[PDB]
Amino acid sequence: AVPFRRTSKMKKRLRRTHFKLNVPGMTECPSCGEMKLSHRVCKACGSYNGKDIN
Amino acid sequence: QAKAVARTVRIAPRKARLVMDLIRGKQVGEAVSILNLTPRAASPIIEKVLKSAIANAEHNYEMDANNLVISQAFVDEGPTLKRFRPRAMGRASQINKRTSHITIVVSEK
Amino acid sequence: PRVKGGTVTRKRRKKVLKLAKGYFGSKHTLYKVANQQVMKSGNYAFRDRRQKKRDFRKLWITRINAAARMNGLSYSRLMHGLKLSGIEVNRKMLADLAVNDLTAFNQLADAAKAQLN
Amino acid sequence: YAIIKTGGKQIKVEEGQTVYIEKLAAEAGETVTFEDVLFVGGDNVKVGNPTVEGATVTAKVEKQGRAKKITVFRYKPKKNVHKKQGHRQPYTKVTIEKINA
Amino acid sequence: NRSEVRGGGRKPWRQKGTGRARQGSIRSPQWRGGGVVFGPTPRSYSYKLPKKVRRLAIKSVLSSKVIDNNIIVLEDLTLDTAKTKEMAAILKGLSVEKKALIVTADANEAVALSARNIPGVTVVEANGINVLDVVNHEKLLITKAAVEKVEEVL
Amino acid sequence: TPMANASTIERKWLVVDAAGKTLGRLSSEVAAILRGKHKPTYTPHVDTGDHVIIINAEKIELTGKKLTDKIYYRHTQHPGGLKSRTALEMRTNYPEKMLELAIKGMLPKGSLGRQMFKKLNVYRGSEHPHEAQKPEVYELRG
RNA sequence: AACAGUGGUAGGAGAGCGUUCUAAGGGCUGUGAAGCCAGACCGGAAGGACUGGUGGAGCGCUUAGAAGUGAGAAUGCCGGU
RNA sequence: UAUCCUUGGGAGUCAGACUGCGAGUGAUAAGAUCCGUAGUCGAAAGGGAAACAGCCCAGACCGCCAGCUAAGGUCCCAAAG
RNA sequence: GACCGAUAGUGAACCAGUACCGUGAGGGAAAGGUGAAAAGCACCCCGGAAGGGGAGUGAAAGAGAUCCUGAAACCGUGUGCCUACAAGUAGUCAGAGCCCGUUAACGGGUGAUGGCGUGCCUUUUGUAGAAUGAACCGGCGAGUUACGAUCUCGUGCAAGGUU
């Protein structure tokens, strides 16, 4: 229940390969496009199917 | 080819590299949208320093912002605050509160 | 008087660390493990300096054996015939050179075949 | 070409070739000669038994020096035994002038 | 010493139960701020030689001075006043450049007062001659009146 | 001064017929040919051998009572899983690997040995599908 | 010159390298001292150069003489990670 | 080619192990104990015995891409019928 | 003063018997250096501020407030050569291919593949040990002095040496 030996740098760096985050799924709005999220109402001018709700 | 630094903003460097990896290499206009659509905690700070670099390029060198791309986007580490937390049976383990330096360089493509 | 003495320690350690360049991982960074690796490497170098003389002759003999077998002989019979005939004092190294560039190797082979009878 | 016997070794030589051999006598700019040709090749094979009568190779001396440094270190595990020693080995540099026969 | 350092006699912790090197006083030679084992101690450095050896040494030094023509013998050596200009003029008049001892016999006060500011010269009485200043001064001035005393004592 | 070789090698294709030959009395010279001990330009770290193709693998033969004596064990990694099959059924059903096992047994171990084994070809029957390489006959010394 | 010899623990004997201070004498630095960092130099070893960068005021040589005289291990002490 | 006297007596050492030969104790057993005698290890690397302190051959000043042999070996792994 | 020079020298070069610990007697730290002179950054730009980029002072601003020099462990960014069929005390000897050019030298970097190869110290008759010790890096850390015996060497003088 206690590590037998210390961990080197190669093993640490190898294990961290999948610890990362991806880009968001985003697209611009037809009116005053501001590169909002897909299937969401934008907060400045990404007017979802009409007016810009917020 | 202007730059901007943060210098001892209170955040752990390992958690800021996670976003600075995302932002590096892209084009300046696209960069801000990704930065303010990401839900992490370092995004407002990185966005502020990037805006400062763009403004430096605009005023001091008359370089225009329709071409800029991000060339250097590293994160360093700064001084540490050491605290304590009492455990069972009078033990008093140790706690670290880390800090980081943030640097961004913008260049004309 | 009191004597402090730090620069001597730093120099003496940096010499070993510069001697251990190219090693894997921490063996090129920390003093204690680099020292041990350097000493082992010295021992190995001595032993292998003897062994390389041991192992080049084997390759020489194998190539001579192949070339002699191409002619209808063995290495042992060819060597006996050469030493028995006109005392050719050519070693094995020049024999291999003459093998890889032959038609001069064959002449010595018939010279030995003549005396083998 | 020819096969000669210099030092405690055997060398194979041709025109214009530069050779590194064991320390001979001294002095540069001199024209040393070897007289132990064992085999003259080329187009007129002259095998010798044990040498080629009336043969000699002339060469020119142009440098004397010492090879690169080697450090010899040995030790025994436990027992507290160490030893260090340095070594540089002298040589002589020559160029082949004319192969007689 | 280890026992002179202002510090503690009690021991910092127990010898068993906890994993730690057994330690007594926090003022032991290995601790940061402990005592110095051995080290400099107040003492004397002088010693003595038999008298005939001393006589031989002084004779040898002031006889080897003669070989190199480094002895000048004078007469009288009177100064009217204690000016430092006069001594410098006199020294220049005798081709003296480096250090130079001056030996008299009568304990002159004008000679002692002058030449005591010149950064190379040294004035001594006939009884005060010893090995170091003779071998450390190149030229050696001396008066005949002092010569008699020197060669009459030994 | 001795001449090593690299990327200057030349290979050839040899056909060997195994009709009445003994199992282990030809799989040793075949191994020697595979490694490349018969060339004066042999080099221990370069694999200067050449390809061989063996036909009529069904006609090899043993001596004594080896047709029922020899046994081939291939324990897997599970407990109690030690399989076995005798040499007679090995020849009647799997001649190719019967020869390949011996040839591989008389070869060095490591990456070079695995490449040298890669350059072998064993067939049953009398015909081989390699006529584009234009192979030639080889008569083993025996 | 000619012959002979050169594994080594406890241990005996011999010859040497570096550090700090003192004495002699001699000489070097703001046109760049010490320290620090590189390199493809030299010596049988312990060691010693040279060149470039940094630094921003000291430092070396020869012959003697003194010693708080050389670190990889003590479940060693202190600090940083 | 030695021993032998003196001095520094300057030292260190006082549970040795296994193999061959001759004995004791003991089931007449021991990788057991205890003696006499030769060797090696200790404090000895290199070749052989698959690996293998004490077994067989043999004693490492340093360099060489030279030659002859010892114990042991010559179908392939792996030098040579 | 052939004494120390900030882990040294007093426990204390700094608001030290202080801060902390104990009911009490009592125990007892860490912490020096901008520049010759504050001449200690008016003004402009990003930012809620902190912090920056210019412009200025200065011999120096990489000298900007724990501000002389600034090593190692530790953490990162870019790039020349290798790496997804391989069994490794991580080296050493042999060796192609590729990229470079030196205190010019039978040069420098990386290395597909082949041979050989059970860390260091301590203690034992005997250890790769499944016998003991060390997370790593840096600093500190152990045969001295005084007074008596005895021997060799160098002197001085000798049947007389020496206060």
Residue E71: give the domain boundaries: 1-154
CA distances from A46 to A25, A28, A52, B32, F117 (A): 15, 7, 6, 16, 67
C31-69 helix and C75-84 helix, angle to the nearest 10 degrees:
80
> Quick check: B101 and B77 in contact, CB under 8 A?
yes
CB atoms within 10 A of CB C11: 9
- Determine how many CB atoms are found less than 10 A away from the CB of residue C42: 16
What DSSP character marks residue A18? G
Instruction: Look up residue E149 and give its amino acid.
Output: K
Scanning every strand, the nucleotide with its C1' closest to C56's CA turns out to be H65
Hey, is the C-beta of C29 within 8 angstroms of any chain A C-beta? Answer: no
Q: How many Å apart are CA F41 and CA F6, to the nearest integer?
A: 11
DSSP A23: P
Among positive and negative, which fits the CA dihedral C66, C70, C74, C78? Answer: negative
3-state SS of chain F: helix, strand, coil percent to 5? 35, 15, 50
Q: Which residues pair with E72 in a beta bridge?
A: E141
Q: For residue D14, give the nearest of D100, D101, D96 by alpha carbon.
A: D96
Q: Which residue is nearest to nucleotide G66 (CA to C1')?
A: C1
In the block, tokens 């029957």 appear at: F125
Whether residue E141 contacts residue E62, with contact meaning beta carbons closer than 8 Å, is answered with no
Distance CA E90, CA E22 (A): 78
Quickly list DSSP for B59-77.
HHH---SSSEEEEE--EEE
Dist. CA E134–CA E58, nearest whole Å: 9
D76 HSE (CA, 13 A, CB side): 4
What secondary structure letter does DSSP report for E12?
A: S
Distance between CA atoms of residues C112 and D3, nearest Å: 19
CB contact under 8 A, C63 and F41: yes
Secondary structure element (H or E) that encloses residue C69, with its range = helix C31-69
Q: What amino acid is encoded at D85 in this protein?
A: Q
Between residues 35 and 64 of chain F, which touch chain C (CB distance below 8 Å)? Answer: 37-42, 44
User: Token pair for residue E86?
Assistant: 């006069």
Determine contact: C25 vs chain A, CB below 8 A. Answer: yes
Amino acid letter for position E128:
G
Residue B40: CATH number of its domain: 3.90.470.10
Phi, psi of F60 (to 5 degrees): -60, 155
Q: What is the DSSP string of E22-76?
A: ----TTSTTSTT-PPSS------------HHHHHHHHHHHHHHHHHTT-EEEES-
Tokens in use for F30? Answer: 């075949």
C-alpha C28/C-alpha C24 separation (Å) is 7
Judge: F42–C102 Cβ closer than 8 Å, yes or no. Answer: no
The residues, any chain, with a CB within 8 Å of residue E70's CB and separated by 6 or more, are E138, E139, E140
The HSE-up count of residue A37 (CA atoms within 13 Å, CB side) is: 12
Q: How many domains does chain B have?
A: 1
Give the Cα separation of E141 and F5 in Å (integer).
91
Q: Which amino acid is at B80?
A: T
Q: Which amino acid is at E84?
A: T
Q: Are E151 and E55 within 8 A, CB to CB?
A: no
Q: How far apart are alpha carbons E77 and E87 in whole angstroms?
A: 11
Beta-carbon contacts of residue E37 (< 8 Å; ≥ 6 apart)? E2, E29
CA–CA distance, D96 with B8 (Å, rounded to integer):
73
Nearest nucleic acid nucleotide to B2, CA to C1' distance: I53
- Measured CA to CA, the distance from residue F19 to residue F94 in angstroms comes to 16
Nearest chain D Cα distance for residue C2, angstroms:
31
| CA dihedral sign, ordered E109, E115, E116, E117 | positive
CA atoms of B31 and B44, how far apart (whole Å): 13
Report whether F115 contacts F34 (CB < 8 A). no
User: Which has the closest alpha carbon to D72: D82, D84, D88, D89?
Assistant: D84
In sign, the C-alpha dihedral spanning C3, C7, C10, C12 is negative
Pairing relationship of beta strands F136-137 and F13-17 according to DSSP bridges: parallel
The CA distances from residue B106 to B2, B47, E74, in Å, are 6, 13, 91
Count of domains in chain E? Answer: 1
- CA dist D74 and D85 (Å) reads 9
| Model resolution, angstroms | 2.8
The experimental technique used to determine this model is: cryo-EM
- Residues F53, F68: Cα–Cα separation, whole Å: 28
Chain C contact for D75 (CB, 8 A cutoff): yes
- Across the interface, of C42, C104, C108, the residue whose CB is closest to D73 is C42
* Distance (Å, whole) CA D12 – CA F3: 14
Read off the DSSP letter of residue A26: B
Residues of chain C contacting A8 with CB distance shorter than 8 Å:
25-26
- For residue F45, the cross-strand partners are none
- Rounded CA separation E103/E143 (Å): 7
Beta strand E71-74 pairing with D90-99: unpaired
- C4 CB contact with strand H at below 7 Å: no
Q: Are strands E139-143 and E100-104 parallel, antiparallel or unpaired?
A: parallel
| HSE (side-chain half, CA atoms, 13 Å) at F34 | 27
Q: Which residue has the tokens 């440094």?
A: D69
How many CA atoms lie less than 13 Å away from D93 in the CB half-sphere?
8
Torsion sign, CA atoms E34, E37, E43, E45: negative
CB F52 within 8 A of CB F139: no
The H or E element that residue F104 is part of is helix F95-105
DSSP state, F56? Answer: -
> Nearest 5 degrees, angle CA E125-CA E127-CA E131?
95
Q: How far is the CA of F10 from the C1' of G81 (A)?
A: 59
Q: Is B7 left (phi over 0), alpha (psi -120 to 50) or beta?
A: left
Q: How far is F32 from chain C (nearest CA, A)?
A: 12
Q: Of all residues in chain E, what percent are helix, strand and coil, respectively (each to 5)?
A: 30, 10, 55
Chain F residue with CA closest to C69: the answer is F38
- Residue ranges of domains in chain A: 2-54
CA distances (Å), origin F41, targets B61, E12, F8, F9: 69, 77, 11, 9
**Would the CB atoms of C87 and D49 count as touching at under 8 Å?**
yes
Residues in chain A with CB shorter than 8 Å from the CB of B34 are: 23-24, 26
What domain range includes position C50?
1-116
**What is the C-alpha to C-alpha distance for residues E108 and E128, in angstroms, rounded to an integer?**
14
Write the residue in D3, D12, D47 that is nearest to C107 by C-beta. Answer: D47
Q: What's the gap in Å between the CA of C89 and the closest CA on chain D? A: 6
Neighbours of E129 (CB within 10 A): 19
Residue C18 Cβ under 7 A from any strand G atom: yes
Q: Which of B97, B18, B16, B26 is nearest to B68 (CA)?
A: B26
Strand D2-4 to D11-13 pairing:
antiparallel
Q: How far from each other are the two terminal CA atoms of chain C, in whole angstroms?
A: 91
Give the residue from F36, F30, F87, F89 showing the smallest Cα distance to F55.
Answer: F30
Whether C43 contacts chain D with CB within 8 A: yes
How many whole angstroms separate alpha carbon E83 and alpha carbon E93?
A: 16
How many CB atoms are closer than 10 A to CB E117?
A: 10
Rounded to an integer, what distance in angstroms lies between the CA atom of residue D49 and that of residue D38?
8
The structure tokens listed for B3 are 């730059």
**Residue type for C26, please?**
S
Domain with B56, as residue range(s), is 1-109
Q: Do C39 and D75 touch (CB under 8 A)?
A: yes
CA contacts within 13 A on the Cβ side of E100: 21
